[PDB]
Design a protein around this ligand. Structure first.
Ligand SMILES: [Mg+2]
Ligand SMILES: [Mg+2]
Ligand SMILES: [Mg+2]
Ligand SMILES: [Mg+2]
Ligand SMILES: [Mg+2]
Ligand SMILES: [Mg+2]
Ligand SMILES: [Mg+2]
Ligand SMILES: [Mg+2]
Ligand SMILES: [Mg+2]
Lengths: 55, 141, 361, 42, 122, 222, 110, 256
RNA sequence: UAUACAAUUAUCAUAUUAAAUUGUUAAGUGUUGAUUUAACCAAUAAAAAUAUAAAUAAUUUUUAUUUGUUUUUAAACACCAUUAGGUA
RNA sequence: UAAAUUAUGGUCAAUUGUUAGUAUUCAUAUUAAUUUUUUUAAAUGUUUUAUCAUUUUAUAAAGGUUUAUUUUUGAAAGAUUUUUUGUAUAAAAUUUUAGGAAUAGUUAAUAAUAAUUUAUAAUUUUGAUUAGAUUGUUUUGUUAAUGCUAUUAGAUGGGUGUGGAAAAAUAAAAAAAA
């Protein structure tokens, strides 16, 4: 591992690699991999009545 | 149980069952019953790495009988080719031919086992014989 | 007072409770984050109709009579007189099938007994759990394709719909047991599966389940992001019914396919066979289209009746063609996307565009 | 060392290491998989 | 090597795509979500990515949630190089929903994610 | 592994859905009261084991002697035929079944489920007693043994007992699976398999047996 | 929880060390955590997150011109309406009103 | 400046001109997007086209699905009439009377000499074709044109029992025109486009009314929904407007 | 400066197949007084017991839901301050 | 669910640090490089022609681009006279930054329309747009090896629009009509 990519430590490199790992990719189940936490608890106090046009 | 974890194959687990039941010196193992698994069993029983085996047309399982010699197993090591089912390793005829050669002497010691385009489970030596490439399963000696 | 202010003294583990306070009792969400304050009038009606009692439909008495006319003939002789041989057994193939009296006691078995006993096994005497099982069995029977069927999508969907309603009202009363919040959400997810499989199995039962129990809320695609990627429709590909439709009864297959050797689309071969597959239109599309059809009448009338205004505008267009950025139409001028293919112009040279991408690609 | 790299208990069978390499980048270039879109070596 | 090249013989790569129709807000334009494949030779394994296309369907046959076959063609407008070649699977359900005057599919409950906290009550 | 709750180790030779025994959420083990007869408390109970030792007995076939009539008149109950044997048998485990954690662990405390151990109370046999004889008299049930006609259990048993599994895994030496065999290092077993015809050899199968017999007999290590 | 359980890596021992943290190491980091928390207490720190604002960016309320401890440092610029409201919140947090849930009070909170 | 420099819709080569012309000699202008405007937009429909010899002679009799009383169709067409007449009352001679509404399943020329033999035979073969077919529930929405915008009609959407209809029609087609040689205006191996003719311009009218129904009238009803109808009754009819207030009917078959 | 983790068992912070939730009981007055504490000081002192079965396994909850901070002392113990109270 | 032979075939995979209780790819090793050394470049005036003109002579200045760059024969080749043909501008995939939020002469239909045509429009958390860095998809080094680690350079808007094609304002080492 060339020492100039990402942080000044090694583990920083592998921590960015995990954003490129094949089995780790974003999808309908695993989403918002890179910031999960900025979006957390965001709609708790947002009250949205669900959609019904059918009785 | 979760994402990062490996996705297991009834080959992976076949191998680790046999490994572990060889370590505890058991005479019988119950083992997952799919196609390439009992294929692998027949191949191993050909090469005399296993005392015998049977499929009862039980759906889940069939059973292998282990062989011991001079106080320890007949199996040094047995390892699956792939940790996942999401990874599929392809063996060129030349590679399988390399395995056979130990610095100029023909060496059949170790056995490697393949699927073929034809759905047969073979060792690498027959494969090399007819020059077919196949998908890797496991290696045992 | 204006917006919620959290206040956090950094030595303390967590902030102070914010601002004019959030509503004292936490809202009850569905699986998707939507909020229900209470059951809908319809669901409410389902619970009131479970509570006071249920009934076997004489649908079953009917089919019992037409299927096994002999047995129903025997019972027909024997009314009111105590029976030692249960002729009625065909009517109740399953233990679960008899819900009118407790512990699965068929009505006609109660003939020769005391009426105290008759009041002892009656509906009014059921526990609540028993009554739920009653509603469940009756519905499971309405949508079952044979008697012992459970696994089928329809049956599953109904049972899960009911269970979900029960848990819902339960949570309405006693607010915090998060065990059942969680069990509710899981039930809801499994209901979502059952329904989205139903509409590709047969859609009318799907419809009337939704109209009976009022669950349209768990069929609503959760969020725009994953919907836009076609992973809401992607579901029934996984479930394997994606091709299941069997066209020929609906939607004549002749105009659905393009021509392979010709290269003409399905709109084309449909055109040629003189057929129209056109989805029903809302007001937008009917209006846009109807406004488009008439461009040539309008134009014709314009250039006949009023040649001057026309000629002015034409002067504009004509001279314009000679002014402007490009006159020549080459690979540069004729770039369908200018800002995208030259991004390297965008900051310094070309000031028209603020961004390199206005569309999918 | 909780904070530090995972180590193998024993080595890896080298033979097997060569067997997993069949579809790797070099063998791909030799198969001619990637498209030659630019001038390349002179 | 994915499904698409499995079913089709393509004259040029990406000349054929199978997908689902997501949204029709534009007359004679069907948006289609479609998967393609990427290979990581280091890990010897594949991933499916997804991509949207604008398809030109003359005559508005498509409803949201149709499984369609899609082809490369004449440049039609700025972004549309694909046209709807064939409907593999129509939406029977969605069409019936339309006939009755309702939208083909219920609109998604939440929009895109936010870094804010929206306090909106009743 | 030194972590508590990871002590049960890695066993592959279990029947559970994980090879890591400590993630398995089904059966929590009990280190204090368990493992009298199985050795360690981690290891699977005798009736659940999927791997078998050389000089140890394997699982008894369940019945649920009439069928031995052709055998030695003296022969007692074959050691592997069991009246009551359950592969699914819940063994009482305190941390599961009697769980004292939310208490101060004083004498009566802890939560117990009674659905594990079979009831020794008198209440059951009193409450349910009836003039109508039991299930077996009434022959309520369909089916029977799930494998249909079974020589040990349903139908009569003829010929020989094989208590080691020697014939039960052998390899057919023949295209027809008529002649099967089992080989050791220096020994060779050739077993004629034709139970339907009373072991009468067909023309082909005999001309075959002459091949197997002398192939095995002219072998180098036999 | 918002704040951090630990400061630095408190479980560092050799693999299979059969505890989260040794006595020595945890003691070191309890020293570190102690100094930080003491700094927060004496400088009378205050933070806030506001609704309809980027949340991870927290206004430093202890640095506002009114509530500022230092008589020297220029505090910070926060909008006049939002600042008035923040001041009113910090102020009305202090004391226990009967009927409200009792919440822990300190010198340094004011 | 408000869009693409050369709008893609404006890029047009005319290959029906000539190789050297448009570079040097002269430039040819046209409004080319009237011609390109497609079959969905214009409302055209490709009907089975007649061979010339058959094209010469008038049609006499046709097959029709008879619409019951109390239709959704008839009602909505009546509303459509009212709206149309309030917009333009020049339509008044074009429009068909709501009493004459019927579905046209195919059109045919019968010579007047062999007339009785042919009606008997037809009626018989027709009764045999539809013996097994139970009533048909069909959907009507959308408009379309025959004969260069002279005939304006309501489409039959292939969303419903229509499928059966197509087999059914294609049977009589192979009997009536295939078996006993009869002039069906098309080829008996091709299927007719079923339709409800709403407005029409006949040869005599064409002088006062104009050569094509102006699309401004029916533009807004072009995609309008006329609804579902179940049909039990098939007719073979000779064309006379007078006799019943309906077309003179030479034969009938009941679907049940 | 470039130059090859693990995949059988690894302790600090990215959870996930789960059966809970709800129960109105107890305790209190005779009399002239050194109890508790290593030791001080305020000063009535007695007390709050019951539930199992059942809920099916997995596949698109990750902007949702969830991990010992809680109205009412005119009820105490307890704890903190010291005779004034706080808190419970 | 049987073995195999008419016997080495189908052409080489092979790992080299003297450490300091133990856990963890980390100082001193070799190979490759920079430290390191004038044996491969070069100077100005392009050239004909019918004369103040007209024919021939089309990608090395800088700016910093990651959903990005794409095209013809009408020039020459080119053969006998004159007409003579059609094929092209479009796409698909691969796209960086430790701690991540909105972007905008704007989509689609109409059409050689509309600085106010019509519409429930387009891009984004499957990570956009700005901003940082950076010359994109046969080139290297190390290695037994899935890897790790390089690869130069070259297309920077329009405004009498010439020319087949803008590649058109020093910086060749391309014989440019005897
Ligand atoms: Mg583009
Ligand atoms: Mg810029
Ligand atoms: Mg973690
Ligand atoms: Mg209180
Ligand atoms: Mg340059
Ligand atoms: Mg940039
Ligand atoms: Mg691209
Ligand atoms: Mg392009
Ligand atoms: Mg310029």
């Amino acid at each position: 591992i060339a020492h100039w990519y990402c942080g000044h430590k090694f583990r920083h490199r592998f921590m960015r690699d995990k954003r490129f790992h094949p089995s780790l990719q974003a999808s309908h189940d695993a989403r918002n991999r890179f910031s999960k936490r900025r979006h957390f608890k965001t709609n708790r106090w947002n009250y949205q009545q669900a959609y019904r046009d059918m009785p | 149980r979760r994402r990062e974890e490996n996705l297991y194959t009834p080959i992976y687990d076949f191998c680790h069952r046999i490994r572990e039941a060889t370590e505890q010196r058991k005479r019988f193992v119950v083992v997952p019953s799919t196609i390439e698994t009992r294929g692998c069993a027949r191949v191993m029983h050909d090469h005399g790495l296993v005392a015998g085996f049977r499929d009862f047309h039980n759906d889940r399982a069939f059973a292998v009988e282990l062989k011991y010699f001079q106080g320890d197993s007949t199996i040094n090591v047995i390892e699956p080719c792939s940790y996942d089912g999401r990874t599929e390793f392809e063996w060129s005829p030349k590679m399988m031919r390399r395995l056979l050669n130990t610095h100029g002497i023909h060496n059949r010691l170790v056995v490697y086992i393949c699927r073929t385009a034809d759905n047969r489970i073979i060792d690498h030596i027959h494969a090399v014989k007819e020059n077919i490439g196949g998908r890797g399963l496991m290696m045992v000696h | 007072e204006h917006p919620a202010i959290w206040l956090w003294y950094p030595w303390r583990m967590n902030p102070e409770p914010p601002t004019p306070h959030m509503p004292q009792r936490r809202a009850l969400k569905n699986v998707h984050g939507a909020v229900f304050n209470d059951l809908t009038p319809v669901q409410k009606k389902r619970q009131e109709q479970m509570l006071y009692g249920v009934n076997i439909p004489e649908t079953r008495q009917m089919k019992f009579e037409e299927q096994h006319p002999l047995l129903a003939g025997a019972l027909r002789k024997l009314e009111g007189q105590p029976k030692g041989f249960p002729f009625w057994y065909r009517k109740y193939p399953t233990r679960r099938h008899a819900y009118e009296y407790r512990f699965s006691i068929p009505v006609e078995m109660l003939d020769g007994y005391n009426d105290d006993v008759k009041k002892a096994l009656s509906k009014g005497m059921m526990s609540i759990q028993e009554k739920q099982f009653a509603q469940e069995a009756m519905y499971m029977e309405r949508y079952a394709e044979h008697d012992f069927d459970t696994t089928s999508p329809a049956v599953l969907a109904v049972k899960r719909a009911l269970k979900c309603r029960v848990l819902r009202n339960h949570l309405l009363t006693n607010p915090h047991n998060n065990i059942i919040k969680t069990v509710l959400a899981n039930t809801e997810r499994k209901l979502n599966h059952a329904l989205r499989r139903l509409r590709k199995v047969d859609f009318k039962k799907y419809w009337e389940i939704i109209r009976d129990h009022d669950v349209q809320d768990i069929l609503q695609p959760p969020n725009l992001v994953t919907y836009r990627q076609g992973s809401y429709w992607k579901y029934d590909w996984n479930a394997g019914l994606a091709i299941s439709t069997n066209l020929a009864d609906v939607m004549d297959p002749r105009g659905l396919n393009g021509c392979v050797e010709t290269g003409r689309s399905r709109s084309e071969v449909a055109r040629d066979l003189g057929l129209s597959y056109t989805r029903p239109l809302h007001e937008n599309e009917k209006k846009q289209l109807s406004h488009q059809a008439v461009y040539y009448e309008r134009l014709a009338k314009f250039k006949m009746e009023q040649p001057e205004a026309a000629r002015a505008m034409e002067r504009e267009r004509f001279v314009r063609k000679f002014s402007g950025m490009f006159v020549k139409m080459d690979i540069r001028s004729g770039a369908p996307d200018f800002p995208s293919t030259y991004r390297r112009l965008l900051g310094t040279k070309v000031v028209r565009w603020a961004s390199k991408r206005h569309g999918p690609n | 060392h909780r904070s530090g790299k995972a180590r193998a208990f024993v080595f890896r069978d080298p033979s097997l290491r060569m067997m997993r390499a069949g579809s790797g980048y070099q063998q791909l270039r030799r198969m001619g998989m990637p498209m030659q879109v630019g001038m390349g070596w002179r | 090597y994915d499904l698409t090249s499995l079913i089709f013989n393509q004259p040029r790569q990406g000349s054929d795509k199978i997908g689902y129709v997501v949204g029709t807000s534009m007359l004679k334009t069907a948006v289609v979500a479609t998967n393609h494949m990427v290979y990581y030779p280091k890990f010897n394994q594949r991933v499916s990515r997804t991509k949207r296309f604008f398809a030109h369907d003359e005559d508005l046959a498509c409803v949201e949630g149709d499984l369609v076959h899609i082809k490369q063609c004449r440049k039609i407008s700025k972004y549309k190089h694909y046209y709807v070649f064939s409907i593999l699977e129509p939406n029977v359900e969605g069409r019936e929903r339309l006939k009755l005057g309702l939208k083909a599919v219920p609109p998604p409950l939440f929009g895109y994610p936010v870094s804010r906290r929206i306090v909106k009550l009743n | 592994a030194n972590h508590p709750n990871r002590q049960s180790g890695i066993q592959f030779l279990t029947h559970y859905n994980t090879h890591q025994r400590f993630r398995v959420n089904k059966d929590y083990i009990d280190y204090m009261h368990w493992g009298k007869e199985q050795g360690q408390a981690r290891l699977p109970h005798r009736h659940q084991r999927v791997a078998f030792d050389f000089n140890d007995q394997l699982h008894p076939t369940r019945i649920g002697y009439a069928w031995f009539a052709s055998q030695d008149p003296t022969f007692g109950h074959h050691p592997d035929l069991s009246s009551s044997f359950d592969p699914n048998y819940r063994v009482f485990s305190h941390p599961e079944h009697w769980n004292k954690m939310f208490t101060k662990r004083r004498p009566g405390e802890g939560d117990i489920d009674l659905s594990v151990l079979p009831s020794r109370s008198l209440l059951g046999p009193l409450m349910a007693h009836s003039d109508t004889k039991g299930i077996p008299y009434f022959k309520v049930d369909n089916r029977g043994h799930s494998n249909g006609r079974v020589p040990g259990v349903n139908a009569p048993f003829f010929g020989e007992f094989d208590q080691k599994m020697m014939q039960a895994m052998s390899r057919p030496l023949n295209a027809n699976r008529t002649i099967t065999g089992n080989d050791g290092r220096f020994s060779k077993t050739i077993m004629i398999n034709e139970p339907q015809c009373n072991q009468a050899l067909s023309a082909k199968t005999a001309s075959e047996l002459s091949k197997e017999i002398d192939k095995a007999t002219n072998a180098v290590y036999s | 929880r918002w704040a951090a359980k630990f400061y630095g890596q408190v479980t560092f021992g050799p693999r299979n060390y059969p505890y989260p943290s040794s006595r020595w190491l945890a003691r070191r980091f309890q020293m570190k955590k102690h100094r930080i928390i003491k700094r927060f207490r004496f400088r009378r720190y205050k933070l806030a997150a506001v609704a309809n604002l980027p949340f991870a960016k927290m206004i430093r309320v202890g640095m506002l011109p009114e509530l500022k401890s230092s008589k020297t440092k220029r505090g910070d610029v926060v909008d006049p309406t939002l600042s008035g409201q923040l001041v009113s919140a910090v102020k009305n947090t202090g004391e226990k009103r009967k009927g409200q849930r009792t919440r822990p009070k300190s010198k340094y909170q004011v | 400046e408000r869009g693409l420099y050369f709008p893609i819709n404006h890029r047009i080569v005319d290959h029906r001109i000539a190789p050297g012309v448009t570079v040097e000699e002269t430039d040819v202008q046209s409004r080319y997007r009237r011609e390109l405007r497609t079959n969905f937009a214009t409302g055209e429909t490709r009907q089975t086209i007649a061979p010339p010899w058959s094209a010469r002679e008038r049609p006499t009799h046709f097959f029709s699905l008879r619409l019951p009383s109390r239709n959704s169709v008839t009602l909505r067409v009546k509303e459509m009439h009212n709206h149309l007449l309030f917009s333009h009352q020049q339509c008044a001679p074009m429009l068909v009377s709501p009493t004459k509404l019927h579905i046209t399943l195919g059109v045919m020329t019968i010579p007047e000499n062999s007339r009785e033999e042919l009606v008997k035979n037809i009626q018989q073969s027709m009764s045999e074709t539809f013996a097994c077919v139970q009533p048909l529930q069909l959907r009507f929405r959308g408009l379309g044109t025959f004969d260069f915008g002279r005939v304006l009609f309501i489409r039959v959407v292939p969303e419903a029992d229509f499928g059966r209809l197509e087999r059914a029609v294609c049977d009589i087609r192979r009997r009536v025109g295939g078996v006993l040689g009869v002039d069906l205006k098309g080829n008996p191996h091709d299927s007719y486009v079923p339709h409800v003719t709403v407005a029409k311009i006949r040869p005599n009218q064409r002088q006062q009314l104009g050569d094509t129904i102006p699309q401004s009238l029916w533009a807004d009803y072009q995609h309008h929904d006329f609804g579902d109808v179940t049909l039990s009754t098939v007719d073979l009819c000779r064309m006379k407007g007078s006799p019943d207030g309906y077309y003179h009917t030479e034969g009938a078959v009941h679907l049940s």
